[PDB]
Amino acid sequence: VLSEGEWQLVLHVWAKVEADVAGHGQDILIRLFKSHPETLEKFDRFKHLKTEAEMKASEDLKKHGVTALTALGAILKKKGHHEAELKPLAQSHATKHKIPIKYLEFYSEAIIHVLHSRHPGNFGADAQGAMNKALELFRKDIAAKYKELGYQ
Template sequence: MANFDMVLKCWGPLDADNNKHGGLGSGHQLLDCFCLQSTQTLFPKFAGIAAGDLSGNAAEAAHGATVLMKLGELLKAEGDHAAILKPLATTHATKHRIALNNFMVRMNDSRGRAGQEALRQVMGVIIVDIDYKELGFAG
């Protein structure tokens, strides 16, 4: 629970406005999960967008806002996240085919080692609880 509490202390600015902080060009890089390469590799709808145009792209920003919203829900559940995780796991295994290693996010260096480690451990718990095998995806 301490790890969830530590991460939630940093989560406030993101949670206050997911739309503002969801895009690559938001200027608030608490999380390093929205990098150009992974966005374009994992989501084909972004593949045809020039690298310089992805930052500030409305569709990419909307996707980032959705990711932040779901991550916030998972964090606030503090481990009691089965009801949130099941539909997320289902769509990411059967529709998007997103491998589990792509769920690992980390706080940027401005949050310090303790914050980074807390988020790593929290995401580790969430990833373990994603049951792709039940869905027929090795992920």
Template sequence: MALSAEDIQTVSAIWEKIYADVEDNGADVLSRMFKEHHHTVNYFKNFTQLQSVAETASAVDIAALAEVRAHGKKVFSALHDMVPHLTNVDALKETINPLAKKHAAELKVDVKDFRILFENLLDLIGEKQGADAKTAFKKVTDLIYEEIKAAY
């Protein structure tokens, strides 16, 4: 699925606003994933704070954890590296492939859990920028998800 020049301009503006608050937004997306899909906590066994509070803490409390904030920033930075490549699928693949391969082979993350992450990102975009922004950015998450899946 290719994005039009207008799509890219729109989603780049959406992403710029979301990325401006990278640490809070990244932590928010991850904490929602952990609360709504508890099995995803298992991927982060080395996050001792998360492991100790995951079952009882609220999403807000989880988002405040330093390790969740740092990883949320890392996830959003990876996405930030992908957005400029939306015009060039080959360059996008080059950016995604190492990340996907590491998550598949080394970290043993189920590819379906990327869909969960993207759903939470889209919900955040919808809350902060409205339904039209959410709909527009879904094209990006669909494209990235398909490329991640292909690399698995």
């Protein structure tokens, strides 16, 4: 359980991301894809992208980034009581898209790296710790649903 102060830190910085959801989304997906090339293969839509310049030039990649960050935003703003938002996403990711939990760990790392690049002054160590806790709780809850559905 995050404290109310921890949730404040998380949502304070999230409100900043929301100034440019598209840019954040591109930066996060590109970081994910470059740091963890196996992740790019899960996306039929994007596996044609072979360079960072091509990734940055993809309007469709930017669209998916906005989709994913907008869903994450909705979950964060539920502060832990996120079960209705999280449940559909766990299902689709386990059953349809077939994303390992470990990939969700890589995605969290990419989020944190970006947030630190774009918001140093609203993302010091306390806010980093808080965000990490939030993203861990997300992954914990996703994992529990994965276990229920038999996804490994």
